[PDB]
Structure formats: structure tokens, C-alpha cells
């Protein structure tokens, strides 16, 4: 198919979100980050592995 299948409007395939903030006690490591799902793009969270 060649119609209405690809955005061709300059969006990334892989997105790396640095944590908004991070704290690290001597027992656990906690990170918080805000991920923004574009304006029209959609993802399933089978992706988004923690690196």
C-alpha cells in the first residue's frame, strides 16, 4: 500500500526520554519521567524497555 500508511511528517522511530528526576536510596532506585505521545502518533507499550 502507498496511501495513508506513513506519516512522512518528520517524526522519530525511537525516542529516548531522560528521567525528569531521580532519587536513589541504598535499597531502591526510583526514576520519574514524562513521556509525550506526539499529537497524532500512537504507541503500544510492548516497546519502552528500561535501559
Amino acid at each position: 500500500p502507498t496511501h495513508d500508511v506513513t506519516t512522512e511528517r518528520s517524526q522519530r522511530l525511537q525516542l529516548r526520554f531522560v528521567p525528569v528526576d531521580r532519587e536513589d536510596t541504598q535499597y531502591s532506585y526510583k526514576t520519574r519521567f514524562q513521556l509525550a505521545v506526539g499529537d497524532n502518533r500512537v504507541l503500544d507499550m510492548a516497546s519502552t524497555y528500561f535501559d
Binding site: 528526576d21 532519587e23 526510583k30 520519574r32
Partner: protein, 48 residues
């Protein structure tokens, strides 16, 4: 002379049942939870 080094207050905080009050957000710190209520610290200096 207030021997209690200045009377303080305890911020009662409870993340689950109480809805977040106005202009509070749940942060990462185990202590910086949204505050549900407050009261004076029970350090009453009685004079003899």
C-alpha cells in the same frame, strides 16, 4: 525561652484515600507526599 527549640507542626499525609488537595502533586520523596492535614507538634513547654 521555649525549651522545645520552637514549637513545630506535623504535616499529616496520606496518599491513598484523600484526594490531592489544591496545588499539590505526589512526588518521589517518601516524605514529600501530599498533605491531608496538619496539627501542632505535641511539644508543650509547661513552666514550673
Amino acid at each position: 525561652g521555649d525549651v522545645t527549640c520552637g514549637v513545630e507542626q506535623i504535616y499529616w499525609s496520606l496518599p491513598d484515600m484523600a484526594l490531592d488537595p489544591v496545588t499539590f502533586k505526589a512526588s518521589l520523596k517518601t516524605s514529600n507526599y501530599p498533605v491531608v492535614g496538619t496539627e501542632l507538634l505535641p511539644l508543650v513547654p509547661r513552666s514550673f
